[model samples]
Target: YKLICYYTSWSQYREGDGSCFPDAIDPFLCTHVIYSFANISNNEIDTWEWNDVTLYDTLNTLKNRNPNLKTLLSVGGWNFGPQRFSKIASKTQSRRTFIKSVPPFLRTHGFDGLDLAWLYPGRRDKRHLTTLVKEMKAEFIREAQAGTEQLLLSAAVSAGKIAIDRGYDIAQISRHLDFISLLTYDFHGAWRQTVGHHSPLFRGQEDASSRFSNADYAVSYMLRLGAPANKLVMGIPTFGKSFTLASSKTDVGAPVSGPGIPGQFTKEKGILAYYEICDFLQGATTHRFRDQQVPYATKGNQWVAYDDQESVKNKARYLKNRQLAGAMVWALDLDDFRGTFCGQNLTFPLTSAVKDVLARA
Candidate 1:
């Protein structure tokens, strides 16, 4: 099984607790560690972060600790958005120019692969994506045949039906990618009038408006689209989506007033790191949604839906039963990377649970 972990470059700038850098990563914990975000400039690839060059050197040093590991550089995160991806795919020549620059760039950074994490191609230029992957794969093959080890190709893709319908030419590019990291989280967040678990394992009882909005539906939808099961990697989030309640009634389908209070460390209004969620659980009321296989914590109308270690175990077992490739973490930074917060003495409790369950299968 392939346990792919993501480490962010900007994590170094985070002030205190939720902060993460490459040095904090346990290299042996994952089969592959993807460094989040590089960008497209002048039809070529480059790093945008100021200290990424030094960070890249620090991150790759983990490979020496665990020779079994693979390191990949990802481009086009949610912040980078869809425009740049569409620009490159607008013309065949533009895509070719982008593809042509990738191999040498990967070599320069000592990266083993490239994770083409375009947020989505949307409706307009979806078909052109196959051309991009096909060209990139062909280029990697040519380079490998010439001498150096073959560069691996993978993608960070959408979870729900709408984006999947708009984004990938899956059956075509599915064959080209070395692995497919299905972003099966973030179905709902604080952006709604009602509160919903952003990454539920099962569908919610009152989820009729958009019935298919859970992890199960997302994975099934992708597989049903002719993507091979062996290459499909399910995603598990190490953070929580939160909301402030309008009334005292706190449940999965309850009404929300606004975003939940930001964590002391992360300071993100609508979200909380797993470590922060652990702190949230100190004296909060726990409401485990049985059918949904997730938990909701309400502290005076501050409602947050997040995965506990047991829930992480649940998702891992689901992955094995489906015979998928492995699990992928949106980021290793958000989890309890340090041993302090959770009070369990186990660092990375959620991800460790996933590794344990997947190991047996």
Candidate 2:
């Protein structure tokens, strides 16, 4: 199985204390590391400050330590939005321009592949997206035949059924991609008044309010939509979602008035890295498990739905049982990369747990 980990470009500065750098990566832990996110400008991919060739070289140098490791450059994240991709993919000239730029750009920087992380496309852009992937794959094949290195093409996809149906022609798109990374996290968050799992293995009984509300349901739906299980990688978050309870009630269906207090390190309202959550849980009160598949913690009015090592272990097992491609962590930086915090004094414990479980198979 392929263990893909996304390494965010901004984490080097945004992580506050003990920020993550290319050297901080545990190259041995994952089969592939995707650097995110390169932006799209003038209908072509461009690099950010941290995404420069220098950093790219440093990342590729890690292969000296783990020769089997592969790296990919991810283009267009949430910040890039859908408009840029929509504009480019909708036109044949622009699409060809972008596709032609990928190979030489990657070859010049020592990257093995490209991952499209376009957040999502609207229903109107679905056909356009398929066409773009088709053309991109065609270009990749031509590049390979030219005696150049073979480059892989993949995409990070939304796990929500609504988003999936609206943004993707599953079979057509999957055919062109080397693999599809399903962002299985963020099923629920502080945006909703009701507290729910950020990433649940199975749907909670209380989650009957929506059919497309859990990881299991999302994966099943993707398969039904013609996504090959072996070509689909399930994404796991190294972070958690927090909520401020409206009252003393802190159950799954409890009323949440707003986001919970931000963590000292992550410093984001309603979001906490696993390390930060680990620190919070140290002094926090009640702990609960949902559907025997998910875990959460509450302290006074603070509620957070997160994945610990155990939950991650469960996810790894599920991946094996479902015969999926592999596990994809949203980011490597968000986890306790330094091993200075969290349950054990270990770096990437959640990711390590996944690798461990997958190795057992």
Candidate 3:
């Protein structure tokens, strides 16, 4: 259960400085960081533009300070288009160009390795995602063989049927990757006509959508598709989805609000992203649902959906039961580091708590 405290570089824009590793960021509890994205675009790699040099210096400084921290460059995010991959995957020269350029990029930056997060393998008609993984793995290996230490290679994968069918071949891809991160979150969101949980355990029964709303189902599906348990990392969300409930009793179920219902957010209309929730909770009392292990706050009419230490405990238990590799939190900035928020202090820093349990297991 080595928890990876993560943040996207794009989140900097929301932080008012458009820079990462702000003085406010908590480095003490973070073990590994997956910076949101870099892209093969606009005649240069996108990391050059968005990745804060100060953050790199901070992380580099952290290496000596923390003694066990690692960082990686993530590629192909949810919104990252595949045109860039298409350019490289479709042409041999472009592929070589990418292979040649990436090592230097990693060496120049303080990254430990690559976290391939292609949204989909053959997505939007780009071919050879499997081949790309294989080739890139070999290229990275070559670098390692040349005496570059700790150049780890991992990938972020989907836990859906389409991903199992049309995405990278998990078994072969796994051979090339040190580990594969399964995006177990985003299984649901606020777009359905009715209120539902964003990340629910797939119950046994199928709804009108002929689906079981559960993370268990997604995890089972991945296991059935040949992903080794220990090689799989489960993704968790720090934020939850909200809905204008018809009433307060929305049954514990997979949130059905995806692309239809008017799910709400704080400080904005529609659903709130994770960072937005963190921002809104700046001065609020944070309470935990002892059973669900999720967090919630109520001041009056507004309500929120979030995960807490107890819920994380349950999820960690689920991981141990399934013999899964570890857990990866979406971002680190959400948790209370010092006394930044009101009365709420993280019971245990999320990553540290995760490691505490994982190390024992």
Candidate 4:
């Protein structure tokens, strides 16, 4: 199966910094895209105008634009206004209006489906995640079956239990959608008081021995809950979370709050775009594990945590072993087009590696 890439908005992305959307992107690799809402505006949503043309109008103009691209308007990204959700997820009448408006809106713009990007279903005091998801799914299923035109439904989920617990009722909600995208990265950071591996496939010395420590555990947890294996899509970070240690370093599981406490980078930020990190392969450190998997890195006074071909290959094997829906990534703009570290293409390292490993399954 092809992967889905979620673009936040076209305004900045249309002509982003050299760091993102580098020359390496080949639109053909992605099967679907969810235009991020935080990057766009209410006017843009109500009206698709771009550089005077519409949003879709500009998308159609891009070179190598995939005619088969299944584009979705992603609503309710992190920090996006939450009150507006009642406008669509609450009242049945509002939902009815939203459904009618979306298809013709897509037909008018030339796209496919709608992806709900709301951060919390029940996180807010005003709403229930389960109820919101149920309403959204109920609306989508009804319209799709009613011949409003074939529509695709997808949602991005949190990596750990907190977000998932608040936003979804796995069994009840999974039944209504085609797939659930599980964000498996961001499990460790300076936000965490300890030094640990970012995306461990197996239980590393630094991970919580009693709980899940890597992508494998993430998928397993979701399935154990209520999500079906085939409907579960595992996620990976194109970027890594780096931290500065208080000391040279402690044991993997030790806390970092001592005299030499670890401080997070204020100026340093994870490169969100893949091509930015990929093109700078000399700056990366690729580490091979005793477990046969490898991790990529970039050295600094503090620490750098990232992934490489070996790790990607390991994750593919893990996913295949479990029979998952497929792999999903945060963004496409970040991959190194040249495949310097893994093969030639980082995206290929991701998708092809997964497919090849799964082929054996």
Worst 10-residue lDDT window for candidate 1 reads: 203-212
Best by TM-score: 1
Candidates by TM-score, descending order: 1, 2, 3, 4
Model 2 lDDT per residue over 150-265, tens place: 89999999999889989899999988899999999977767767877778888767557676778899899999989899899999999998899999987657998999898776
The segments of candidate 2 whose C-alpha lies over 4 angstroms from its true place after superposition are none
- TM for candidate 1 is 0.97
lDDT of 3 at 115: 85
Tens-digit lDDT track for model 4 on 107-162?
A: 56555666666655555523444555566566556666756566766777776766
Candidates 2 and 3, the one with greater TM-score: 2
Indicate whether candidate 2 or candidate 4 has the larger lDDT: 2
Taking all chains together, each candidate's TM-score versus the true structure is 0.97, 0.96, 0.81, 0.76
lDDT (10s digit) by residue, model 3, range 1-361: 5566666565455443222343445555656777767777543445634446666555556676666778787877877776666666766667666766777777887788878777766654334776777788888878887776857788887766666577567767777788888777665555555544455544434354635345677788778878888788887766565555444443444233233222222233434554445565666556654433456553333446666556666777788888998888776544433333324554225544566667777
List where candidate 1 sits over 4 angstroms from the true fold: none
Name the weakest run of 10 consecutive residues (lDDT summed) in model 3.
Answer: 257-266
Whole-model lDDT per candidate:
0.88, 0.86, 0.62, 0.56
Candidate no. 3 TM-score: 0.81
Q: Flag the better candidate by lDDT, 2 or 3.
A: 2
